[PDB]
């Protein structure tokens, strides 16, 4: 309706949503929105551009859902893939190994635990080949960047790549 009216941009409408309503619920909506087949995907093409415009909400999107939902978001709208890989690339690099407990952990409370990130990567991998090679290469290039070790203790990305076989 607002698309054909052309009065205010949909961005303003989506921003007022974000401000006003329960956010948690809201986002699952959008997520489902993106996979609904066309009915008259101008809507879907508006939501990708709103999200990419605002990185801060899209940080809580990738944070707030399950893995499968975001895996399908990616295989359908590949304009999201390399920003979300960017997010993990940014959260993994905020980990450290501790030798007492056989685990990476976060400094801060709000930092993805190991298991969460393992899930999400396992998902990107359990996917179509169009994404799988992208994320595999995006990790191997991240591994070489932090020393190509081939034992854990050292490179978070070693860890992931061992864990995924």
């Amino acid at each position: 309706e607002v698309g054909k009216a052309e009065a205010e941009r949909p961005a303003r409408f989506l921003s007022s949503l974000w401000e006003r309503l329960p956010q948690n619920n809201f986002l699952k909506v959008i997520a489902v929105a993106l996979l609904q087949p066309p009915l008259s995907g101008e809507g879907s093409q508006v939501l990708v551009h709103w999200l990419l415009g605002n990185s801060e909400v899209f940080a809580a999107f990738c944070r707030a859902l399950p893995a499968g939902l975001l895996t399908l978001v990616t295989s359908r709208h590949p304009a999201l893939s390399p920003v979300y890989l960017g997010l993990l690339t940014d959260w993994g690099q905020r980990l450290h190994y501790d030798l007492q407990k056989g685990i990476w952990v976060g400094t801060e409370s709000q930092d993805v635990p190991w298991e969460e990130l393992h899930n999400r990567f396992q998902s990107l991998c359990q996917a179509p080949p169009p994404l799988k090679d992208k994320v595999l290469t995006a990790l191997e290039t991240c591994k070489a960047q932090d020393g190509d070790f081939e034992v854990p203790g050292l490179s978070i990305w070693t860890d992931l790549l061992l864990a995924l076989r």
């Binding site: 056989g102 685990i103 854990p152 061992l162 864990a163």
Partner: protein, 150 residues
Amino acid sequence: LELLVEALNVPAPQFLIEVELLLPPPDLASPLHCGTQSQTKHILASRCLQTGRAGDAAEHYLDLLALLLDSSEPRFSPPPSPPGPCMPEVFLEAAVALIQAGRAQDALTLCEELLSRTSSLLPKMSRLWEDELPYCPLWVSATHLLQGQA
């Protein structure tokens, strides 16, 4: 000690009661306890190593180790006895000499020799994947520690 070792290289019963009969075969606390070449040559190498004659030490440890391991054909020359050190603590002392020397490409034929023989004994280390409980004898965890210093 150097003389002694060559000494122990070298080697009658009367139908009578002799004194030898009545004496006790001695203890470890006694000053009459004298091991075999192997048990000593280990002493020479230990005593050579704690002074800082790493070079001498190296050779001595190698000679220890030559005896023990080549020995299918001759007399049994034996390990250092088990109030004395286990057969792998002794490949480790051999390597720590070979490091004090700076013979590091010998100190790696050592740590290769060891874990070649003892494959089976090691953990298959799949707790690494599954991320206290599984069992690893200190000398395997060392062997990597001195494989490294090399």
